Ligand binder design. Sequence first.
Ligand code: GTP
Ligand code: GTP
Ligand code: GDP
Ligand code: MG
Ligand code: MG
Lengths: 426, 201, 143, 428, 428, 22, 22
Amino acid sequence: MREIVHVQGGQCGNQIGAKFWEVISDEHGIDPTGTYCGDSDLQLERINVFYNEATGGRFVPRAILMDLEPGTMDSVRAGPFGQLFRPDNFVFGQTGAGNNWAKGHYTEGAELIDSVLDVVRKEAEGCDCLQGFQITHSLGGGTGSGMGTLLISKVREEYPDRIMETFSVFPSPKVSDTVVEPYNATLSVHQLVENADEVQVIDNEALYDICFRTLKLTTPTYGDLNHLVSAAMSGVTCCLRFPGQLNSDLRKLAVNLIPFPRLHFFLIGFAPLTSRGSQQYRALSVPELTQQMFDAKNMMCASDPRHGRYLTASAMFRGRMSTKEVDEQMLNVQNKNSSYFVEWIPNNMKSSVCDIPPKGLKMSVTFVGNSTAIQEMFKRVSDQFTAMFRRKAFLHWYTGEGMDEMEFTEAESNMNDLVSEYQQYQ
Amino acid sequence: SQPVFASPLNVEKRRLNEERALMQAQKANIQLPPNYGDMDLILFPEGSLKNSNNTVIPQSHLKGKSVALYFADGADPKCASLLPFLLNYYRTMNEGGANQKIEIIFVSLDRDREAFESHRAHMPWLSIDLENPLTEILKRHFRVMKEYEVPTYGYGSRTGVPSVIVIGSDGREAQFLPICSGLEEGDRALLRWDWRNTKFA
Amino acid sequence: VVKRTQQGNYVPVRPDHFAGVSVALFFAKAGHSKCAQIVPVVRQFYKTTNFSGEKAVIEIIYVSLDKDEQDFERVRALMPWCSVEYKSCLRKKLIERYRVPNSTAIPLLIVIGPNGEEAGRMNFQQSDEFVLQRWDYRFNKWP
Amino acid sequence: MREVISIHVGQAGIQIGNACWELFCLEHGIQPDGQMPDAFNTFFSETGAGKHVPRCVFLDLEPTVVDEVRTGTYRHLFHPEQLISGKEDAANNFARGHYTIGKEIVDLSLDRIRKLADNCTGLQGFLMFNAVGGGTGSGLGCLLLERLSVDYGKKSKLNFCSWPSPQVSTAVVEPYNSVLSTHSLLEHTDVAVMLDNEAIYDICRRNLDIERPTYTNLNRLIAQVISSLTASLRFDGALNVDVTEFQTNLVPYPRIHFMLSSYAPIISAEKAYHEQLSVAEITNSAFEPASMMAKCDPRHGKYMACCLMYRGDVVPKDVNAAVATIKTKRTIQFVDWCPTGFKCGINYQPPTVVPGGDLAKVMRAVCMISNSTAIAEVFSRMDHKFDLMYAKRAFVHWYVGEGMEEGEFSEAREDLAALEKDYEEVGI
Amino acid sequence: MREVISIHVGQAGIQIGNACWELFCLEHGIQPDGQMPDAFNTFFSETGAGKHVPRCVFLDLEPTVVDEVRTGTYRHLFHPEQLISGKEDAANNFARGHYTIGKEIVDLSLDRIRKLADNCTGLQGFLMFNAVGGGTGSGLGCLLLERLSVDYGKKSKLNFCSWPSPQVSTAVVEPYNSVLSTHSLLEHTDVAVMLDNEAIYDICRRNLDIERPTYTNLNRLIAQVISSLTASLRFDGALNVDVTEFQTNLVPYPRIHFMLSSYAPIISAEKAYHEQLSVAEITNSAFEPASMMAKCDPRHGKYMACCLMYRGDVVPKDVNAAVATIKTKRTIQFVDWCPTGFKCGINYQPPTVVPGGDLAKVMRAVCMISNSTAIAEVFSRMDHKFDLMYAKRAFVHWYVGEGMEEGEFSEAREDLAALEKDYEEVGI
Amino acid sequence: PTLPFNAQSCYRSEYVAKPLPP
Amino acid sequence: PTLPFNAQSCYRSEYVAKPLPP
Ligand SMILES: Nc1nc2c(ncn2[C@@H]2O[C@H](COP(=O)(O)OP(=O)(O)OP(=O)(O)O)[C@@H](O)[C@H]2O)c(=O)[nH]1
Ligand SMILES: Nc1nc2c(ncn2[C@@H]2O[C@H](COP(=O)(O)OP(=O)(O)OP(=O)(O)O)[C@@H](O)[C@H]2O)c(=O)[nH]1
Ligand SMILES: Nc1nc2c(ncn2[C@@H]2O[C@H](COP(=O)(O)OP(=O)(O)O)[C@@H](O)[C@H]2O)c(=O)[nH]1
Ligand SMILES: [Mg+2]
Ligand SMILES: [Mg+2]
């Protein structure tokens, strides 16, 4: 069949994607020691999309972990579901990139990228025919943004037709540590636009905003933010692992959401999301779900979708439901919200049904949409970049490592063209 | 002497049938020792096979069907992977027709009774209890071994757990289904099970 | 194994009664809000369509997912149609044969043909409540 | 004997094929195993000890539907390599399923079609079910027509395409795949029957009164339609009409073979028993404009030809009487140059209802396949959708990169316009 | 009475013969002891009370495969000195096969061949099993053929060579070995049949769905082919075809006797349930290009002559109707100097299935041996590999050190080139 | 603290055995 | 310590006393 190779880099990319394997193994019923429990065939019939048989019956994830420091690798291994991963698939550094894209990409990340290219060649070539790659990382930091994007550039040269989708955590709107943030962000963005087929954006103040009104959590730790990300993360591959009335894999999604090649930045949302108190007082019907996922305060980017136009979008429904009432409602949203969409594309919206809803619910939907309202993000990073680049601030950590001044202008020329290209279509 | 000669079940077979031959010769130009075709055994006695919620099912209800032994373990991950495929196969195959065709008799290699009941709570087909010495004499007869610990009389380990062996009326193996075998086709060897020819007569 | 409630006690069912008519089993559970929703509606529907005529046209065999003899006898004390026996293996056989997960599944009516295999599936965990009469009791009558 | 071969391509092709091969199994009384406890020869073969295998091929480039048929209830009914599956889906791209990944499993498909057509002669024709708006239903279907017209040139080809609806489409790439496949099935498909999803949603919402239907509720209705078209081959009747019978009676011109469909009576459990299903009544309900199965209002069209397939306890006088009322009714307009445009094909066998379904046992039924000039609007909708998107080259680079040149988009545009002009000038 | 003597030299010959002899023991119903509980006479002798022993010789220069036959299940079936063993392996060297080691074991073989031949006159011929890729199968196999033809002159000498694959090798010096053998067996073997491991691998994959077959899966299918050739010698037939019929009907010129094979049906248990195995279908699949036994595409040649051995409940009617269909179909071409071109042989006995094997019980089967012009290619790809590496004298110091002179390498090369021209001149 | 599995495919739910007409 | 020998030849695996046909 097909297998999605999972490549995981940086502190954020490990920590939100280690608990990705919490959720996938829970749905597929994997004991943390690797055995299967759950006495049904629908899980296990298509399990090689994310696992490998290991001649003793245990299922190892086809996942690769990257970092330039051994701190978070110890923590991922030491938690629950830490023994699932193969110890060989770990690749360690000893120095660590101190929030510097230059030593993530050019200088220190070069001595490690040969080893991690070796492990990704072993477990992508050894299969029958892979579909694509799934890379999880951040942009504010050094090891996730820098050395992660180096791997994206390397694999896109090696495998030039497989799909390449990224669960990228963009910089923060308002509250931000890692003071040299837009330098790492802008450099990663102009390298993402040339090599990544799909990019799915995540903001932390988006996730904080979800769990303050909807989920009503008073004290949200980093674990429950990742549980919210990994919920919509595993929904993108519902069609691959489980059968359904209308299937839609990643290449389905790419041709259906991307009108023009340079603009492929998406917007992730998930529904339903209710507190534990009001869990049992709601009517879980497809009118309620569709209103939940077309709402500005349900997205995982804190950029207003009412301030732009949805170019194209897609909803991938999960659960036993009615194909008529999912078709009428998803046209019901277009009939009233016509001023929120674009006019030269008829029927912007995609339906797909998976017959296996996520665990402990009975009906779910994930929303991914190519919106031109994402230009408020790239303007925000660009004007922070412009303010810090006129004064030549913080450049000496980048020029010192062996990076030239010119590609800073090149990166700014790329995102201003990216902002302008989205502005034509509003 | 099928499929082995040094089996406890085959030894017991030869003793009873040749005792019958001697008594018949004493009562009455008869072949001593008797031919292997003419030797006969009763395989599952009256107290062996029990169905769901513990009701005795005799050997009479296995007639005209394809009967396979499922040598299985509880904590073996290969067994846990193979179980749902065989559940779906059994259910679909028995629904597909007026009469029911296949049956599975479960032979356990578990550690203890708690593991036995915990694993057998899933299964809808017939099962042989762990204390009954049939569950070890059939094991030695069809050459199943988790590890080389049994005194084994020049055998090779024919299979490792899990395995399914289609059995004949007189204990001969109708066909080996190759899950962990020379063909190594896991969870898809079940499709090779033919049921016209391997009828438990 | 299948009992009928009469004035005072219970009687085993006659196998000749199930012929000439149509048969559905009712998978349910005492103490469930939706089961208490649906039981009286099916009761009034049953009595109307079976006493509006000379010959009976349908019957229901009630199968329970209750964990208590007290609740089982409680619902059997007021439900008019047939019932199964609690300790008989046929109740668990029907469960594992018909895939009720033991919620959003109970109540359920599975209409069964003469050869023991289903002729219809009907649920109530939905907005519509006029679905009881969507089952034809004249195409599928047992011989 | 009199055999037809049904080809299922794409997810809509497979899932429609599940409903029709459930109904034909029940109708001839064969089990999911494959053996029953010679009228079934038109759809089933013979294999030794009474097993009858279907004369069908399952094609889809994506495993997740064909593989799940193999694991399902009908395991041993279908031959194991009569179900053909690829590795990666066409993924809503006509260029993928036609140039890059299509060609790998075409030769496997023709090999099984060759081996199934050479069993006996007297091959009556081919049937194909596919989704126009999908990837492999359009992609692999166009290749499979092209490489079947060259080999079996003489035989008829009846297509049942699941055309995208005007409102609901579940794709932005569907105007591209619609107009790119119309250039395929103009010159290869003999007679195409035009199916629409939310037309059947409207039928099953007000006739049979399901508020929330699904794909397994629409596919039963399609299965009853296909069973009515091929009822005449299977069973004896008063007026038998084959599949060669349809091309000579419905299409007057080589390029004009696009036609609607209708069924009557689509009736529920409660409604059926309380109602006289007169022979006059089911014909009148068939010609009702909203009761068509395409969402294409025929009042702004002209009926060129029309065939009525009766099924049940139908006497020929009531057929002659009822259709004379239809012709003298003023609402529906008939074309001046075609004075006679009606068919009576009367069959004895009643429609066999799937239990657990939604329809009732009815004593008689009528299925109408009508060629009308109302097809101009359903192409004008897809034409205007294609003009908006192609005005600024949206979703074009996906097609160009897989091998399709830029210019097949150009030429298929006037091909649809050439089709549109012909339907205008024939209505004069 | 009627006898055939089987010679199995080399590791491939012995392990082919083990599957070949368990089929004959099972089909005639003898135990591994050798006594059953008069069709056996061509294969099994008569000694003592009920014991039958095979008319076979097993040859190898290394002990590690004939000693392990002596220890396995079939000890007492074979005569003790029908299993001739050497001391040292020939080690992939043709020169070692002729001149160094083979000059001491050949005297033991001819003594056992002569003693087994002379017990009755009516010796139908010698079957020879060898691998032209190896040392003792090619080198010592040549020495037997030179010694057999000088004494047993006009007896028919069939051969079955496991010719090396175009891509699969397991031996790097096999370009040298099988070129030298070709110059040898050209002027001794009456009829040579090429068997190719890559050919049987693809047969086991697309028919039986065996993803990982081993060598013993291969030899079961080879055993069935040998059984089908000699089936008319053993059992009664409506139209007999013995060993002498093969050569007189397939070898139009004395140096043109390299020929192909195809066996049909090869069907597992899960697929025999759904196909009827009509005489038309089993002979259609025999001529399929992907159904061959030697991995050479038959479309780039013309069939010089053809022989079809039907085995089972084959009515003589349906042979003529089916072979008329093959002659009508034009993707298969015949050369102009052979207008009548087929051979038909029917035997009533259906094939015998080994328990615990891979095939299923079938009621009929076809074995087809074809002399084609397409054999020029399997020699030409062989021809090019030898020249590409002899020209720099690689791997020659092993050959010249063990006795043969370079100059035999050159002579064998031009003799192949003479054979290469012969296929070209005859294809006109 | 896991939960059991209670979902089946739509094909497995609507495409089962079916009683033949007499 | 030691590990027990477990292996048998492929000849002995699949060339055994097959049951004769009737
Ligand atoms: N009536 C009906 N239509 C269906 C069904 N399944 C899919 N469709 C139609 O199929 C269209 C989507 O294209 P698909 O058929 O899923 O795609 P495909 O033909 O399988 O080709 P791929 O995109 O490569 O998978 C939708 O617009 C539906 O109208 C079905 O079961 N019944
Ligand atoms: N068909 C078939 N071919 C075999 C088998 N075993 C070996 N071969 C062929 O034998 C070739 C290798 O030569 P061998 O037969 O092993 O060598 P040999 O003929 O015994 O002579 P030596 O090289 O001296 O051992 C391989 O290329 C195989 O094609 C078998 O079991 N079946
Ligand atoms: N949502 C989420 N965000 C994180 C997590 N870990 C780090 N981040 C974000 O990533 C940034 C820190 O960069 P980091 O990933 O540690 O740098 P790195 O060492 O190069 O990988 C901060 O802006 C955080 O908001 C996490 O577990 N969850
Ligand atoms: Mg498709
Ligand atoms: Mg050797």
